[PDB]
Design a protein around this ligand. Structure first.
Ligand SMILES: CC[C@@H]([C@H](C)O)n1ncn(-c2ccc(N3CCN(c4ccc(OC[C@@H]5CO[C@@](Cn6cncn6)(c6ccc(F)cc6F)C5)cc4)CC3)cc2)c1=O
Ligand code: HEM
Length: 436
């Protein structure tokens, strides 16, 4: 069964009102599920991330993973310094110029799949979408080619896989430390060091090029380095390398996987997606930036996919002074937990919440008001939002143009939780070419 901790929180939120104490963490924390509260705490620089919660990202099993990178830096000043600089890499011109990378990798994904489109060969969409998102990220952020889509870098994607399973366990055990052997523990440490070392090398390869007076176009890497000029160590730079290395591919992959998974049982939705893709791009191969804006219906489908299946389920702020929240006195020094997964599944905020219905986001439908935030909100919202929404439309658009998917019998629709929420089963499918 693929219930996650988020599902328990949901149960408790429906039953116990909009402020609920939990005791699964470092502390009595409080899960906060009223829209007004979401607005209050997220939409204000006055509230900041809980350093105690994000320590699980800082280091893992004694090994430095995300450090004080852009996600896990809780101190506002130190965080604003990083964010000002790194923001330059996500300008509109910065993103428009990634379209070629997004197209190249999307195209390459589809060809690999058309090569397997006999209707018998089982293919892990979760693996495939992961390879694609990784190849996009490496090229787009770091100027490097991983070619996982071409069977390359098996150790790299092994290190990522273990690091992530490692995060799952780093939360837990829990009496389960006698059974789950030292093998897993040191493999995770190995993996985490593998990742930092890839960072060291790609920082090297980059510095080498600049030293030969070579011309390097402005980059996420360019901006992470610049955020680090003056530092005694490269250690704050590696934090940011690893953060972007994982954040910039894993959750885009989960989102793609959930979308393909859910679409496999929504034939009407699929037909309408096909109809839209036919009129916007036809059978043309490259999608321009202007084309993405016109995939209106595809936007709604993805928004709806993020409402039921948000990979990044929420966030935590620290409540420093005792405050009254929805009629409940909550003491100072208390961690607040926000969940877009929880709120998206409450019939209080969404009629018939288990029905996948993209019309909820149709033009003219009032936007959800603090009941939906798959990219978080306020100052600590996702820097990579537009980047993600772009690449995901590029991939999904191409799949829809050329392929049809059928989920392999015995594949489940349920969730697991690693660093993020993702499908429990890979998304094993057989494929045919569109029109069969
Ligand atoms: C027995 C022991 C016992 C005692 C000792 O008795 N004990 N005592 C205390 N606890 C304890 C304490 C704490 C927990 N927590 C449970 C989980 N928590 C947690 C924190 C942060 C989270 O952030 C999620 C990231 C955010 O962003 C993403 C997504 N994303 C955005 N853009 C792109 N990707 C992201 C970022 C960067 C990347 F690089 C990749 C990513 F995907 C995902 C999520 C969860 C904290 C630990 C549990 C138990 C015990 O168990
Ligand atoms: C569809 C996939 C994506 C979703 C659902 C997602 C969602 C989120 C959310 C919920 C936050 C977490 C904030 C918190 O812990 O409170 C966030 C932050 C962040 N994400 Fe994304 N994201 C995705 C893709 C991107 C990609 C492509 C990148 C990089 C290119 C990335 C970069 C980051 C970083 C650096 C932050 C921290 C920003 C800051 O605190 O200033 N994400 N993401």
């Amino acid at each position: 069964g693929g219930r996650v901790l988020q599902d328990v929180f949901l149960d408790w939120a429906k039953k116990y009102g909009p402020v609920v104490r939990v005791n699964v963490f470092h502390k009595t924390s409080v899960i906060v599920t009223s829209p007004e509260s979401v607005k209050k705490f997220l939409m204000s620089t006055k509230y900041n991330k809980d350093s105690k919660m994000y320590r699980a990202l800082q280091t893992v099993f004694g090994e430095r993973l995300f450090g004080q990178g852009l996600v896990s830096e809780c101190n506002y000043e130190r965080w604003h310094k990083q964010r000002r600089v790194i923001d330059l890499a996500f300008s509109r011109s910065s993103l428009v110029s990634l379209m070629e990378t997004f197209n190249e990798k999307a195209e390459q994904l589809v060809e690999i799949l058309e090569a397997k489109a006999d209707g018998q060969t089982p293919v892990s969409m979760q693996d495939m979408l992961t390879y694609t998102a990784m190849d996009i990220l490496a090229k787009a952020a770091f100027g490097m080619e991983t070619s996982m889509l071409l069977g390359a870098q098996k150790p790299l994607s092994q290190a990522v896989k273990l690091m992530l399973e490692g995060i799952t366990a780093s939360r837990n055990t829990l009496a389960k430390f006698l059974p789950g052997k030292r093998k897993q523990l040191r493999e995770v440490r190995e993996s985490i060091r593998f990742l930092r070392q890839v960072g060291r090398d790609w920082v090297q390869r980059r510095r080498e090029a600049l030293k030969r007076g070579e011309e390097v176009p402005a980059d996420i890497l360019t901006q992470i380095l610049k955020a680090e000029e003056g530092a005694q160590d490269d250690e704050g730079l590696l934090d940011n390398f690893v953060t972007f290395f994982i954040a910039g591919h894993e959750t885009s992959a989960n989102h793609l996987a959930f979308t393909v998974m859910e679409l496999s049982r929504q034939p009407e939705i699929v037909a309408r997606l096909q109809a839209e893709v036919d009129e916007v791009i036809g059978s043309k191969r490259y999608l321009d930036f202007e084309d993405l804006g016109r995939l209106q219906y595809l936007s709604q489908v993805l928004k709806e996919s993020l409402r039921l299946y948000p990979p990044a389920w929420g966030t935590f702020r620290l409540l420093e002074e005792e405050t009254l929240i929805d009629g409940v006195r909550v003491p100072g020094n208390t961690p607040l937990l926000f969940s877009t997964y929880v709120m998206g599944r409450m019939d209080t905020y969404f009629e018939d919440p288990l029905t996948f219905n993209p019309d909820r986001f149709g033009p003219g439908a009032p936007k959800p008001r603090f009941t939906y935030f798959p990219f978080s909100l306020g100052h600590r919202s996702c820097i990579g939002q537009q980047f993600a929404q772009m690449e995901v439309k590029v991939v999904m658009a191409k799949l829809l143009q050329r392929l049809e998917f059928r989920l392999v019998p015995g594949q489940r629709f349920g969730l697991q939780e690693q660093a993020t929420l993702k499908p429990l089963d890979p998304v094993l499918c057989t494929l045919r070419p569109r029109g069969w």
